[PDB]
Design a protein around this ligand. Structure first.
Ligand SMILES: CC(=O)Nc1cc(C)[nH]n1
Ligand SMILES: CC(=O)Nc1cc(C)[nH]n1
Lengths: 348, 348, 348, 348, 348
């Protein structure tokens, strides 16, 4: 017996949908769900989605509360829908996928991912749930995550981090590093060798290597000297150039983190969604240097150094393609006299 | 197990709330309730009330579908709340009363009208439902309707008409004429002698007496001659004066009905609610004669004639009070040289 | 170059989307689209759909303005989507189908119905548009309408009427009677023998046979005598019984039309959508007789007489299935001593 | 002369409703109130309540701007309505009570708390306002606060802190510690002996005793040794266990504050309201340890130690009831072999 | 070809409107603009203005992204509209001006500021754009900013700071200090000699002189001794008096910044807009001292000291007028026995 009042009862008593029996009084006003608590209305949910308020409330209550892949990974792997769960996208305050399978009567296209309506969609399967590995084997298109070996299936070790209730973390009390598998048209696809983005924040950035510790603690010229980075334009690409009206370079998150500790700046997230490469309209508060579209990627500095040092520097300009988070990221590489001028995630 | 989906199931399958088990998918968008029917959304309800959309939907689904007293009668009798029913006010597209008793968890102040929260409120009791005559006996304040006699209690015969699903009618297949009883502080009141308004429409007006048939069929001067109405200003009060910029008189619905058959006119219902006296901003389309506040009452022409002929015509101006639909209606009576100049429901 | 301003320009200048170049200023406020005309805002569209206002505006502007099958026919034939058109559902003030093909970038699942996304969906094809008969030949699932014959394919003659801009009519200046073809999994189906509903209105009902003329002009007992209908409960089923609180029978639109000419009544369309059988909460204004769920079908009286006269009257109660508008309609048949007691479209 | 424009004038010129004469131009759009300031609209208020925008604006403008009891105290004391003031609930961005007395024409149930409509409600009275102590003496149900002695009335010394414009504080320039009194059915009730919650925040937590200073500065094992807390499960209850997928214990705010200084974590306030015990869906960012419903109380560590040390530890499981903020708080006490296993505010 | 989809394409690809060709799918729901990105809706803009959502979206996309005068300066100079640009007011999340010139078809009153509709309005002109100095010379009313000399026009050196994408800053990589010019009724007006407010924040306040460094680092009595400020009531005016229920003085931002480092407090910005003098409802969290209307100005402490030391202290009370940000600011000066009691920006 699925109902708005039962979903609300579960949120109030269990912190989320937990299949418990019960009902609480609910009032819906505009895009907000309230419940009566001792005569007064208490807000349970504000709809920030393009779905009807009561439908979005139910999908949010039915969100997966285990560590799940970050939405950028699912998107890069072509995931269209999840099997019998909701992957909540905390970057967008919305369900990661339009439709559901066995979750909500309003958004369900099927009750089971074995229904033929699901065959053309890449269904997300979670091996931690009974029967989901078998459902992936029977699925025409799909992405599977597991905590271990699936007999005969060649795995892809994914990122160390996962999203647990919107908190991206590397698990200590829980497992966040999964094996990934993908099928396209009934055929298991070999996932490519890839780098992974680190998913760090500007305000709580922590270094994850000796090189990263040295970047944050050492001065620009001594770091470049220590890591033999002369001629690789790190002064522009990583540290950033704030001397002209147009802000130069600044494409690695660690470079923004170093700058942030000294001088504040505004980052306008004009397409707010989870993605491997992020685009910001940046305004440096100290200098007034700005850039409408500043592409930023959070790679471990060692990974970025390996990528830039593995390029041929004899061409004026060329597209450099790098697999990051399972997707092909195009970078624009500009050279002059055998040295780098700039290297940035190519603005499509 | 009360729920939005269960209320919606009942509306879809039973035409209203009928206590049936079942659920249908629902979507709420702004003030509208939809249900999914074969992949597409179908509108079930548009909220025109000041209550939350899902709460108003439930009270409307739980509306009384038997002939009930017209809201103007309940209001005139001081009814605050109904016992275990919702009197739906079709003039306002809203519940007639703010709160409920044993109807909806969001609006309920009590489950049974015997709860002490109900003692100071005039509760409406319906003798057609088992135990309601007995609950009126135990209630401090209340109004009771019955189809037959109540032992020891003398009845007040109500109007012939009742509202059945928003259609005011005099029943032939159902009883619409009720016996009324009222208690104030545990004491059964003596309800006053009263006239009743006829609750007719302008577009489907039917005469209910030989005098009314004669008013509609005869010319003004011969009707006044036949019923000895000279000096009673019916030319102004009932027929209406459309010769000046300000529309004169026209306070009886039968007079508006007679005019409507010949020439159309606009009636702006600027306070849309059920009331004994209605106020309209009228604009006569043929002449351009108009009046911002034209008070209109639908009395049987014989009743209006009895009222006007029972007045002292020796005073220039005075307030004439008449019990109509159990309430005191003030009329302004203007006389000159022993004859009526005007007589209208006093705009206060 | 598709845009809101271009869609609005087409509506203002062409009465609908006509592929014309141009832009007009637009303002969107809540669910309404306005355009500036000489300094003031003029309403172009009010969104009554569950889609975003600008998306619904575009689909409505791009509606098919030729006579098209009534939505009840398309639904009964399992149509999921239309090829390169929008079938506007005027009963719901919304698009008949969730998604589009080659119509609007927000709702398109494909640009051409030959895309593999369309293969599992029953696509509606219109033989009056070039290449659509050929696209039906290549489609896995679909419904085709034509004005003439299709080589090798045997046709199913559809209803005489079609919907032209929301007006259901039998064409004189345009063709409204189509040949129907349907394919399921690449195989041209044999469409079943079917009756068709007449799609008439209560307020403008016209008889379409001598029997129907006789039903409307003759008295109940002489019509039943003339057409040898004794023992078939037409007094209850067709004419209606208004003598008890629950309105008896009244399931044929012609019976409601005959009643409507004499006495008015309220029909509450509680599931407002196009369907072969309609359900109304009816309240007879004259008697006060009412029914929460009164199923009404508009069959030609001759067709209804053929159906009822082709039934075995020896069973107390049974389900009678009749193909109407290509769908299986279940009727409940109740008999006693070899005569009909009642026969109604089964409320399920 | 109460008006929207006058309320807006007071907000603009006095910072709140101050009974001043004047009007400013106002525009209402959706749930926001604006005023024209030199040709442009400036936002004065955004309605986050379930009341109409103009009504909520007026109640917020008419909010009590003196230190008042925290809403959790008023709720625990059964307060239904306030006499001639609005207690604004800053946790909910809404009025603490549905109705008013002598405040706003839309929400007023009475002008004076002596009206019989108020007799069944527990009215809040403020002794700092002339005549309110006398109104409490005449009230059938009520809660009174005073800054001093009321002759013959036995007082209850309340918490040190009060809310002043949504800032909970212990007054230095103003008095925040009141005497509390309560009446139920005309009878003055003896308020129970109680502990009080400290109303601290996680981000600005300050210790209020030597034990609390020692908890925050000392390591877990030396604090437990110093205060003889061996066998009382403080490692689980207060410090928290982050080693398993389900976060263990962590029910005292001081324990969360200590953790917060070292590692950040997410606290989802899924029922956002003021209450003695708060429930959070917690996700520890460092470990990934989480709990859907983690009940947290802010007791002074000395008070919590007194409570836990005053319990019999010979039973496996039992409900321990403790008066906190005038209300009975149930705790679940789990013991094994004479030692505590867990002790938490019982999830109802 | 201006369109909603083209504006959205520019925002997605260029970070703002940049005149680029292209379209992206857009959905408008209530007051939010979304775009489809790989099947899911991503929020591009939330309308906080009183304009229609699509119109506000376009004006925000077309905002001036160069350093522009702060809105408080434009308002103080009487600016009504901008020539061929939108000055976005980040304090109000809205356009600084109601109408536009050559920007958006919905808000344009003209395409060029030379149109006679513009003659009575004070048009803002930007000398950094070709032809704008000439348009100011031809304009009847206007305000011009330049980065240099305009032949024959006497300049006014404006504030050092400008707003760049809502970040107020003193430019290093860009010029933020402009020359200002104003015309009223075809006549160039001499701008008055003025002080400028410093436009600092409470949370990131930095001193801009040795006196300001000394105010923040020295104790109250030694700063007053060092700068010979005895008898000038800085203890009240600048430092603030938190000893009584009504918070005394505290009218200089530097005084609030000094207090903020020690004890937190709530500043309610009840008229949220950019202005030379700001009014806050302040509540000191430590003491509970509060003031409904606390006028605060951010003057450099040296400028405030010069103003207060340039006043005659022999009158009990008088209005002191000071030009600040080109506007006349009235201050109330209260003296006793030749010493200052209080000096505050006069509450109108
Ligand atoms: C006070 C009171 O007598 N109420 C009654 C009596 C009866 C017979 N019905 N209701
Ligand atoms: C399967 C199939 O034969 N479809 C056809 C054939 C023709 C002549 N039209 N459509």
């Amino acid at each position: 017996a699925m109902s708005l009042e039962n979903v609300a009862f579960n949120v109030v008593n269990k912190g989320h949908f937990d299949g418990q029996q019960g009902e609480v009084p609910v009032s819906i006003i505009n895009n907000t769900v309230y419940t009566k608590v001792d005569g007064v209305d208490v807000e349970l949910f504000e709809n920030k989605t393009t779905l009807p308020v009561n439908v979005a409330f139910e999908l949010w209550a039915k969100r997966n509360i285990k560590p799940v892949p970050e939405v950028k990974i699912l998107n890069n792997l072509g995931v269209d829908i999840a099997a019998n769960t909701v992957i909540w996208d905390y970057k967008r305050d919305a369900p990661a996928h339009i439709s559901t399978i066995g979750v909500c009567s309003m958004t369900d296209i099927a009750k089971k991912p074995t229904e033929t309506i699901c065959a053309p969609l890449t269904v997300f399967f979670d091996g931690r749930v009974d029967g989901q590995v078998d459902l992936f084997r029977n699925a025409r298109n799909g992405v599977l995550i597991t905590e271990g070996s699936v007999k005969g299936l060649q795995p892809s070790v994914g990122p160390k981090q996962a999203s647990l209730n919107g908190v991206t973390l590397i698990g200590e009390a829980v497992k966040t590093q999964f094996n990934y598998y993908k099928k396209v048209d009934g055929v298991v696809q070999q996932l490519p060798e890839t780098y992974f983005t680190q998913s760090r924040n500007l305000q709580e950035f922590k270094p994850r290597s000796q090189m990263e510790i040295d970047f944050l603690e050492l001065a620009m010229d001594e770091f470049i000297e220590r890591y033999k980075l002369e001629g690789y334009a790190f002064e522009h690409i990583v540290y950033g150039d704030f001397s002209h009206s147009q802000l130069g370079g600044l494409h690695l998150l660690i470079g923004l983190a170093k700058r942030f500790k000294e001088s504040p700046f505004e980052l306008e997230d004009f397409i707010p969604m989870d993605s491997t490469v992020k685009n910001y309209f940046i305004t440096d508060a100290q200098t007034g240097s700005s850039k409408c579209v500043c592409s930023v990627i959070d790679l471990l500095l060692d990974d970025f150094v390996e990528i830039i040092k593995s390029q041929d520097l004899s061409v004026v300009s060329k597209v450099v393609k790098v697999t990051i988070d399972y997707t092909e990221i195009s970078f624009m590489l500009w050279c002059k006299d055998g040295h780098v001028e700039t290297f940035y995630p190519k603005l499509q």
